Ligand binder design. Sequence first.
Ligand SMILES: O=C(N[C@H]1CC[C@H](Oc2ccc(C(=O)O)cc2)CC1)N[C@]12C[C@H]3C[C@H](C[C@H](C3)C1)C2
Length: 336
Amino acid sequence: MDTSKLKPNDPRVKYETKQIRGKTYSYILGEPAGPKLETVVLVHGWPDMAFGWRHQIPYLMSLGFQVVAPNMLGYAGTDAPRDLSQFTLKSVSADIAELARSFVGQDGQIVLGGHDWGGAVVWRTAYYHPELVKAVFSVCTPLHPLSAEYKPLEDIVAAGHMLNFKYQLQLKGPDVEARIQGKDMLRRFFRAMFGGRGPNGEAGFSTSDGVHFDVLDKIGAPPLLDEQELEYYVEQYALQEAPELRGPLNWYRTRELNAKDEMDRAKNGPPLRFEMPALFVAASKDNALPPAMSKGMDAFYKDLTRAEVDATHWALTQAGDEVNRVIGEWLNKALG
Ligand SMILES: O=C(N[C@H]1CC[C@H](Oc2ccc(C(=O)O)cc2)CC1)N[C@]12C[C@H]3C[C@H](C[C@H](C3)C1)C2
C-alpha cells in the first residue's frame, strides 16, 4: 500500500462515528495491510484533529496495525458537551477506553499514542486503564505527576513561574472563542497556529500572550500546512456549533477539575507507575513543551524508551518520517 501521508478525504481510511459514553465520537479508521497485529489508538491535541496523524496512520497500517484516530471531545465531527466535567483527563480517558474496546473487545488491548493534549490524555489513560493499554507513547508531552494541590494559573504566572504557559490564560478566557468564529477567521487562526507570519515576520501566536488578533488579517501562508490541508482544518473545525472554538478551548478550562480528580488519586489511589512499555518522543524546537521539561520523568516507568526529533511543536508532520520510524522501531521492541 501507499504509505504517503493522508490527504484530505483520503480514500485509504474510513470516516465513522460511534456513540461513546453519551457523546458522538467521530474518528478515522484505517484497516491493516495483512493480518491485524494490534490496534493503535492515536490521540491528537490542540488545535489539531484526527487528521493531524496523517503521516503516521498509513505507515502504521502498512505494518499490520488497525488504526483508530478519534477527533477528540470538542473537535470536528465529535460532540462538544457544555459540561466541563466531560473534558477532564479522567473522563476523556474513559471515552478512549470505551472507544478502544468497541474495536478490540472488552478483554482486548491497544497500543495508545498521543501528541500535545493527547499526550497528556494517554499517560492518564494508561494510568486509569492499565488493563487496556499494552504500550503507550507520547510525542512532545512529558509526564506530569498527579496533582497534589490546585493553584490558579493566574497566581502561578503572577509569581513568575510557568511563564511559557501564560498563553493558556487567553485561551481559557473569552477572547479567542469570541473572536475566532466562522471559516474566514478560522483560516486566519490556522495560518497563525501553523507558522504563518505577517508582512514583517510577526508571529500570529506567542506562548506569552496567545493569539495575536491584530496580526491575523495580514498573516501569510503557514509553512506547516499546504493549501488543501489548511482548508480541511477550516472545514472540519467549522462543523462545530458557533462559537466553533468552544470545544477545543474547553480543554484549557479543566485545571481545577483535573486537580480535584488527581488530589484524590494522589492520596488514596495508586501511584503513577507505568509497567507497560512506554515511549516518549521529544521535539527539539517545541517552545511550549521543550525537551528539558521531561527531566524527572523516567522514575515513573519500568520500561521507558526516549527519543528526540529535530522539529518544532508540529513534530508529527514536520518530522513525520523520522517520528514514524522511531515509533515503528520501538513497537518492534515493545510488542515482541
Ligand atoms: O498548550 C498546548 N499546546 C499548544 C499547541 C499550539 C502551540 O502554538 C504554536 C506552536 C507552534 C507554532 C509554529 O510552529 O509556528 C505556532 C503556534 C502552543 C501550545 N499543550 C499542552 C499539552 C499538555 C497539557 C496542557 C499543558 C501543557 C502540556 C501543554 C496543554
